[PDB]
Design a protein around this ligand. Structure first.
Ligand SMILES: *[C@@H]1O[C@H](CO)[C@@H](O[C@@H]2O[C@H](CO)[C@@H](O[C@@H]3O[C@H](CO[C@H]4O[C@H](CO)[C@@H](O)[C@H](O)[C@@H]4O)[C@@H](O)[C@H](O[C@H]4O[C@H](CO)[C@@H](O)[C@H](O)[C@@H]4O[C@H]4O[C@H](CO)[C@@H](O)[C@H](O)[C@@H]4O)[C@@H]3O)[C@H](O)[C@H]2NC(C)=O)[C@H](O)[C@H]1NC(C)=O
Ligand SMILES: *[C@@H]1O[C@H](CO)[C@@H](O[C@@H]2O[C@H](CO)[C@@H](O[C@@H]3O[C@H](CO[C@H]4O[C@H](CO)[C@@H](O)[C@H](O)[C@@H]4O)[C@@H](O)[C@H](O[C@H]4O[C@H](CO)[C@@H](O)[C@H](O)[C@@H]4O)[C@@H]3O)[C@H](O)[C@H]2NC(C)=O)[C@H](O)[C@H]1NC(C)=O
Ligand SMILES: *[C@@H]1O[C@H](CO)[C@@H](O[C@@H]2O[C@H](CO)[C@@H](O[C@@H]3O[C@H](CO[C@H]4O[C@H](CO)[C@@H](O)[C@H](O)[C@@H]4O)[C@@H](O)[C@H](O[C@H]4O[C@H](CO)[C@@H](O)[C@H](O)[C@@H]4O)[C@@H]3O)[C@H](O)[C@H]2NC(C)=O)[C@H](O)[C@H]1NC(C)=O
Ligand SMILES: *[C@@H]1O[C@H](CO)[C@@H](O[C@@H]2O[C@H](CO)[C@@H](O[C@@H]3O[C@H](CO[C@H]4O[C@H](CO[C@H]5O[C@H](CO)[C@@H](O)[C@H](O)[C@@H]5O)[C@@H](O)[C@H](O)[C@@H]4O)[C@@H](O)[C@H](O)[C@@H]3O)[C@H](O)[C@H]2NC(C)=O)[C@H](O)[C@H]1NC(C)=O
Ligand SMILES: *[C@@H]1O[C@H](CO)[C@@H](O[C@@H]2O[C@H](CO)[C@@H](O[C@@H]3O[C@H](CO[C@H]4O[C@H](CO[C@H]5O[C@H](CO)[C@@H](O)[C@H](O)[C@@H]5O)[C@@H](O)[C@H](O)[C@@H]4O)[C@@H](O)[C@H](O)[C@@H]3O)[C@H](O)[C@H]2NC(C)=O)[C@H](O)[C@H]1NC(C)=O
Ligand SMILES: *[C@@H]1O[C@H](CO)[C@@H](O[C@@H]2O[C@H](CO)[C@@H](O)[C@H](O)[C@H]2NC(C)=O)[C@H](O)[C@H]1NC(C)=O
Ligand SMILES: *[C@@H]1O[C@H](CO)[C@@H](O[C@@H]2O[C@H](CO)[C@@H](O)[C@H](O)[C@H]2NC(C)=O)[C@H](O)[C@H]1NC(C)=O
Ligand SMILES: *[C@@H]1O[C@H](CO)[C@@H](O[C@@H]2O[C@H](CO)[C@@H](O)[C@H](O)[C@H]2NC(C)=O)[C@H](O)[C@H]1NC(C)=O
Ligand SMILES: *[C@@H]1O[C@H](CO)[C@@H](O[C@@H]2O[C@H](CO)[C@@H](O)[C@H](O)[C@H]2NC(C)=O)[C@H](O)[C@H]1NC(C)=O
Ligand SMILES: *[C@@H]1O[C@H](CO)[C@@H](O[C@@H]2O[C@H](CO)[C@@H](O)[C@H](O)[C@H]2NC(C)=O)[C@H](O)[C@H]1NC(C)=O
Ligand SMILES: *[C@@H]1O[C@H](CO)[C@@H](O[C@@H]2O[C@H](CO)[C@@H](O)[C@H](O)[C@H]2NC(C)=O)[C@H](O)[C@H]1NC(C)=O
Ligand SMILES: *[C@@H]1O[C@H](CO)[C@@H](O[C@@H]2O[C@H](CO)[C@@H](O)[C@H](O)[C@H]2NC(C)=O)[C@H](O)[C@H]1NC(C)=O
Ligand code: NAG
Ligand code: NAG
Ligand code: NAG
Ligand code: NAG
Ligand code: NAG
Ligand code: NAG
Ligand code: NAG
Ligand code: NAG
Ligand code: NAG
Lengths: 127, 445, 127, 127, 445
């Protein structure tokens, strides 16, 4: 059982089995002197909360809060990536795949929001 | 068909910059680094080795070296802020020779006291380096060097300058990547990566031309330089064998405290006991010049069959032309000309104690960060003091000649104060982890 | 597609389709000088997190976290508003309605809490 | 209806009826002077957010976010406690029960993450 | 079978330390406590009674008392930071007897002014306790006591020392447990617990040997001590009936302001109207003896049939050998020798006004927290001042005798400044609530 971030080199398929270890370490003297070290510590604690909330709020609006893995209604556009489904989940790693969707990451996020928002209104709000 | 899926807690990262906080084995007497207010370090820090991972490193473009420099400067000013300011010391000083050996001067001068309506006449020795004549003639009326640019702040005698280790940690959601490749030069793709939440014990040992108490090389003498061929870039070399160096201050000074004002006093070297003795440092000649041969041959790999030559510092300020350090209370300035004085030819082989002696100078007024003004007065430590250090690195500089000869000259260059930190932080880099990831799959089955 | 807060004047039925844009903007130099501007920025960043958490925690206890629209078990009371279901959703706007339920907003929140806990208590806890 | 933390002495079974009041009080002048009182208030506000997030993030990874009560897939090991179900839920209080699981609390938390993450991977990730 | 389930919002807690913030009925003139920046208190604070709950309390090991002590000291220094520093007052003073009654001294001395190239000769009275002779000869010469250790900071006349109540609150996710047990001595298992988000109105009143304006016992005189049998531990006793104490400063001084520097002035007493009168305090003898007899018999329960004997405080500093307090602007120091002077037998019964008189001394330079230096100069309040206080507690100390006698002496000891806060915070304790709970059940049906 690898530690924190120990499965970074493993393939995409095998690296997703330990997502809990990386998700757990996202937020881990009562008095504060507000000195050189105190000021930096205060900024670090505040920055850490914002980093977690900035990443957690997206899952909430996307309808996947409290779930490590979830599927959305947005279909996969082949233009983003035309690579087979075997090599991606059995040969490639997360780092190599990150440098291929970064261009379309912002667009994918917006597509998921409008898809989830529209589906929510279509299902709920009977009248 | 295929549907897009989002994964949380994905193991990916990117280069970034963040406010790193300090962690230390907290345990009490205070120190200039103010580690008492630092976070306590864990007893068993977690370190993980990354398999199949290879990451690019660049210690020259690193941000931790720049961030640490500001923190050290900020801590230095914070420690001196509550101490007394030596504003009334700026007065005419009448000095005479002490009863070479002219390094000291028995000066006398008028001074104030707690009673604003009364004054007092006192006397105290002063190093010639921290004294400047007011006028060319009169052989008196000497003035403290810093007096016409800023008023120095006397260091609080209760705080010490012990360079205790401090660990730099990253906030949550960030990690520090460590390169474990053997003989890594600090630049390129590391073939052995590792991760750790906090760096090892970093000792802020301020030194020039010679790294003291630093980390030792693992198996071979490593050399680092952004552009080895460039003559304007400093060259950092790490040794494998720690060259022990001893220093001593045989002058037995007598501390005397004079109250300059209400609730504050000025502590000055009072009187000498015995006889005047020159401060110096020792180092084994066999163990010292032996490493030069190893360093010389290693440098030869980057410049063909050319011969390596070591010469003394070119010239300039005393802080850059001498090996500066501190024996826990007294700042020394030793001449290294006795070390970087030799020539090595391809065949040259080094083949008893015969310890080398390095004369040294001592100063009370100093500018640690080379900043205009903001000087500091170091109080004298009573009695004789001795301190041993481990020489593990050297800051070399190559002359800007045509280099078309069959030899090459190297000079111990002071470089920049940031180079001292870069010699230890080269094995680290801060990266921001992005737990959110996207990937497709044939979901909804 | 109107920008942030662009559907304020639109009717209730038409303004519920763009809730995602307003929900996304609720949380949108690393060093800090702690000066006049730095102090204000630090307070602003901390205040923003508290404002979001103060509003997000209510949905958690109510059992609606991770969702934009949700229906509770508390039945509607005509005393709060006797208007028909057509005029409110097809004619009135959110701003005009906000000045009608404010008197009963706090009471409705408490009713939803006890209603959710009782349902949780009744469904789960088999013994 | 007892006030905040009023059901501390009641039995475990009866204390679960008022979880909402305790969960609500976890996060309940705009300018800041940064003085002696201001510095303490700033630390208190930041400390409160971390306390809630540190406790809330655990429910998210465990898959129980937005739910006051939830059942995990980890079976109850008799080694932790061999007491019957009636005595614990109808005779013992939460305070007394807290001093019996404390030793196995950390182990139970770790087992829940892997139990939920494994099930999450087995259900989703069709290929 | 059974499955493990997690419950959120469970009612459990544990002892913990946290940064408590202030809360006050804010409503304006400033005060030394800087309550204007404090959070406004709620109009209807919530309090809940815990049924079937019994919690352990320890007022001696409580963290609130230690935390409050630092806050009071921090606020004290914060208020004095923007005020003028009396650095030029350290000068030779020529004094003569005012025109016992030698408590004052009409002193004269040189002083600077706004114009740096000009000086002025001024005069002002000074209490003998605030003056120290110079050279131990030439009675004319005199120096301010604090001058050789620190420069006292003059208190801003615009801020008052009124001890308005302040409520200590815990951050979200924490609570304060209050023990409602009748006659609780402060230690042991409380049989009547309650919870509240904020403590009651705590008045930061500073007093020695006698608690003023403090809480009162509900039904019986309570006694508190970590080890009653130990003679090295202070004994705190709370009264049931408040003993009103009157005080007055009959001297009618005239405030005169002299500009010591540009934009700053020093305040002192110019002259006196009428004859010199000694400051004192009054207290009913009938309502005082009584308290003792009740205190004496109560103390007898912890020492068998031994007779209780109260004696005046032992020697030492003036701050610990006298009852110190402040009538909203002037620091008093009264003898108390007239209150702890009596012997009570196992049958002794106390059985008209006959008010007792306590002579008092007044000082301007004081060290409230007994810290070296960091003194403050209290400006004189014009006109006559009077202030009444409610005596509700006493600080007693038992002599370290063999204890084999048929009696025992009790001395009013000043103890520590933290004892004043402990007398009011004994009914509170901070705990951390852990809403995450775990318990099994036959779920998944
Ligand atoms: C505000 O600031 C002003 C200006 O600084 C200051 O005025 C000066 O105060 C000092 C202290 O009081 C004065 O000092 C005295 O001055 C006279 C005059 O001295 C002159 O003349 C003599 C005689 O020719 C010369 O030797 C001398 O050099 C000067 O020219 C003297 O009478 C005083 O000396 C006596 O007192 C000294 C202090 O005790 C002794 O050390 C000394 O031995 C003398 O003792 C006296 O008593 C003895 C008996 O016990 C007797 O035997 C002696 O003969 C003698 O009578 C002293 O030096 C000074 O003059 C003032 N003026 C000036 C212009 O400096 C203010 O005092 C100050 N105000 C306040 C409130 O602080
Ligand atoms: C490179 O690394 C080496 C190894 O750490 C450093 O060497 C030490 O340097 C420190 C000063 O920085 C030396 O400290 C001083 O040592 C004195 C002698 O210690 C011996 O004797 C005392 C009793 O007299 C014993 O208690 C002690 O255990 C030793 O047996 C002490 O007397 C000094 O104490 C005074 O100063 C300190 C600091 O202000 C105060 O806390 C004390 O109260 C007291 O006033 C002091 O501890 C240390 O001895 C050196 N060790 C060796 C082996 O020589 C190098 O300095 C370092 N180089 C650089 C450049 O950083
Ligand atoms: C224990 O508790 C008692 C009761 O609170 C305290 O007694 C009071 O002490 C304060 C000082 O700490 C006294 O305050 C002063 O009272 C003066 C007289 O007040 C009467 O007269 C004025 C008009 O002259 C009326 O306005 C007032 O209502 C009264 O009828 C005032 O003249 C003083 O004014 C100064 O302070 C205030 C406040 O900062 C300023 O606004 C003014 O400008 C001025 O500077 C002042 O208010 C108070 O009178 C005492 N009350 C009694 C009944 O005696 C004890 O001090 C306290 N003991 C301890 C040790 O804490
Ligand atoms: C820098 O320069 C300063 C001077 O500018 C040097 O300081 C002086 O150094 C000399 C030599 O050390 C000191 O004088 C010596 O004092 C010894 C004291 O020993 C004891 O006997 C004394 C005898 O008392 C009578 O005589 C003295 C004066 O001689 C009077 O003051 C008394 O009132 C008596 O009448 C005692 O006073 C004393 O308490 C001892 O019991 C003495 O033995 C030597 O013969 C010699 O006189 C001189 O005092 C120093 N001055 C000061 C102010 O310190 C300084 O050392 C120089 N520094 C260096 C490094 O050279
Ligand atoms: C502490 O010690 C100081 C002195 O060291 C005391 O201060 C002095 O106290 C005396 C006595 O109170 C003051 O002198 C007195 O002043 C009274 C008021 O005088 C009124 O008439 C004067 C008439 O003017 C002419 O005469 C005066 C005096 O010669 C000249 O100054 C003028 O130029 C004129 O020629 C008015 O000037 C004055 O304003 C009044 O209206 C007077 O009745 C007395 O006979 C006596 O002279 C003296 O002025 C004080 N000095 C200062 C600087 O204040 C101080 O009180 C002592 N404190 C205590 C408590 O004892
Ligand atoms: C540090 O080592 C790296 C290799 O690990 C050196 O990188 C090579 O530098 C030469 C310079 O001409 C380039 O041509 C190569 O392409 C580089 N290789 C890689 C993999 O980057 C680097 O120069 C070394 N630095 C020094 C000065 O020693
Ligand atoms: C590193 O330094 C070398 C020189 O030591 C640079 O290479 C050339 O050096 C000659 C002089 O020897 C100059 O006239 C050229 O202008 C240099 N090249 C260029 C393109 O400027 C070299 O460029 C430097 N940098 C690197 C990345 O090697
Ligand atoms: C616990 O302490 C509380 C303190 O208020 C007691 O409260 C009682 O309150 C009622 C209603 O106001 C009064 O009539 C009673 O006199 C109070 N009792 C006492 C003893 O003062 C409560 O009774 C206490 N409980 C126990 C078991 O002692
Ligand atoms: C305060 O009261 C408690 C009881 O509420 C006292 O605790 C008892 O102390 C005696 C000392 O001999 C022990 O034998 C008992 O076992 C203690 N009981 C409990 C419940 O702890 C405590 O001593 C009292 N303190 C004072 C100073 O009177
Ligand atoms: C409380 O103080 C008593 C004494 O008043 C302590 O009991 C003994 O005290 C004598 C001196 O009177 C010491 O020599 C003994 O060593 C003490 N006994 C022990 C066992 O240390 C008592 O210990 C103190 N503490 C408590 C908790 O009662
Ligand atoms: C406590 O009371 C005693 C009573 O004797 C005081 O002692 C002395 O009293 C006699 C007679 O008045 C004087 O001659 C002595 O000078 C006093 N001094 C001492 C220390 O014996 C004692 O001073 C009183 N202590 C305090 C602090 O008031
Ligand atoms: C308290 O008891 C002690 C001891 O009995 C008393 O002091 C002794 O009194 C006798 C009287 O004859 C003297 O002989 C002794 O020398 C005294 N001291 C000692 C050590 O025994 C003391 O006076 C009593 N105090 C009061 C006033 O009751
Ligand atoms: C897929 O991507 C291409 C290229 O960007 C784009 O033209 C096309 O509209 C996209 N299709 C969908 C359905 O989003
Ligand atoms: C798997 O990845 C490796 C490394 O990039 C590559 O050489 C190989 O062709 C890949 N195989 C397939 C089937 O895509
Ligand atoms: C990656 O590392 C794993 C774990 O050791 C190993 O099984 C695998 O063969 C490695 N892959 C490559 C391409 O080196
Ligand atoms: C350093 O020492 C050498 C002798 O070892 C001497 O020739 C040279 O001038 C010195 N220069 C300095 C003080 O740097
Ligand atoms: C070594 O090489 C140098 C030239 O670099 C030459 O002058 C010398 O004679 C050689 N001597 C030996 C011992 O090989
Ligand atoms: C509806 O509102 C009325 C008026 O406030 C109130 O009396 C009644 O109890 C409410 N009914 C319910 C079911 O809440
Ligand atoms: C139950 O607890 C015991 C004692 O700690 C342990 O040995 C055993 O493995 C546990 N069983 C399971 C299924 O976790
Ligand atoms: C108080 O005690 C004294 C003895 O100290 C006694 O003489 C007196 O009668 C008692 N009562 C009164 C009213 O003073
Ligand atoms: C206090 O009064 C007593 C007499 O009762 C006396 O002996 C003592 O000296 C006085 N001391 C003080 C501090 O007033």
């Amino acid at each position: 059982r690898r530690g924190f971030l120990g499965a970074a080199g493993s393939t995409m398929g095998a690296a997703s089995i330990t997502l809990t270890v990386q998700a757990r370490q996202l937020l881990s003297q009562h008095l504060l002197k507000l000195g050189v070290w105190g000021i930096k510590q205060l900024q670090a604690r505040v920055l850490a909360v914002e980093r977690y909330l900035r990443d957690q709020q997206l899952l909430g609006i996307w309808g996947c809060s409290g779930k490590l893995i979830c599927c959305t209604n947005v279909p996969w556009n082949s233009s983003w990536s035309n690579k087979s489904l075997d090599e991606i989940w059995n040969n490639m790693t997360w780092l190599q795949w990150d440098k291929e969707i970064g261009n379309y990451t912002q667009l994918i996020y917006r597509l998921i929001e409008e898809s989830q928002n529209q589906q929510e209104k279509n299902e709920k709000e009977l009248l | 068909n295929l549907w897009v899926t989002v994964y949380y807690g994905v193991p990916v990262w990117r280069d970034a910059e963040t406010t790193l906080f300090c962690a230390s084995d907290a345990k009490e007497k205070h120190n200039v680094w103010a580690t008492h207010a630092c976070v306590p370090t864990d007893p068993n820090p977690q370190e993980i080795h990354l398999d199949n991972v290879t990451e690019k490193f660049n210690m020259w473009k690193n941000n931790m070296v720049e961030q640490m420099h500001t923190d050290i400067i900020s801590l230095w000013d914070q420690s001196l802020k509550p101490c007394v300011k030596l504003t009334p010391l700026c007065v005419t000083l009448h000095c005479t020779n002490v009863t070479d050996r002219e390094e000291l001067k028995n000066c006398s001068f008028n001074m104030t006291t707690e009673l604003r309506d009364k004054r007092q006449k006192v006397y105290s020795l002063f190093y010639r380096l921290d004294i400047v004549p007011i006028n060319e003639n009169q052989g008196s009326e000497y003035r403290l060097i810093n007096c016409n640019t800023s008023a120095c702040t006397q260091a609080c005698p209760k705080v010490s300058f012990e360079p205790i280790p401090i660990h730099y940690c990253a906030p949550a959601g960030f990690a520090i990547l460590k390169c474990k490749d053997e003989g890594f030069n600090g630049t390129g793709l590391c073939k052995n990566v590792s991760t750790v939440q906090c760096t090892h014990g970093i000792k802020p040992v301020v030194s020039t031309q010679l790294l003291l108490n630093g980390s030792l090389a693992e198996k071979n003498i490593t050399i680092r330089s952004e552009n080895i061929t460039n003559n304007a870039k400093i060259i950092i070399v790490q040794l494998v064998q720690p060259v022990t160096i001893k220093c001593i201050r045989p002058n037995n000074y007598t501390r005397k405290s004079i109250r300059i004002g209400p609730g504050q006093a000025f502590y000055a070297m009072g009187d000498i006991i015995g006889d005047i003795r020159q401060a110096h440092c020792n180092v084994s000649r066999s163990r010292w010049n032996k490493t030069l041969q190893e360093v010389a041959e290693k440098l030869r790999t980057y410049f063909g069959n050319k011969t390596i030559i070591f010469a003394n510092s070119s010239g300039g300020d005393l802080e850059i032309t001498t090996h500066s350090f501190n024996c826990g209370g007294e700042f020394f300035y030793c001449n290294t000309s006795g070390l970087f004085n030799s020539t090595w030819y391809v065949n040259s082989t080094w083949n008893s104690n015969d310890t080398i002696t390095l004369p040294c100078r001592i100063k009370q007024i100093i500018n640690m960060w080379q900043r205009a003004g903001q000087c500091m007065y170091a109080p004298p430590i009573p009695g004789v003091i001795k301190c041993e250090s481990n020489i593990t690195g050297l800051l070399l500089t190559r002359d800007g000649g045509k280099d078309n000869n069959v030899n090459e000259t190297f000079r111990p260059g002071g470089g920049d104060m940031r180079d001292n930190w870069r010699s230890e932080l080269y094995k680290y880099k801060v990266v921001e982890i992005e737990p959110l990831g996207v990937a497709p799959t044939r979901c909804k089955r």
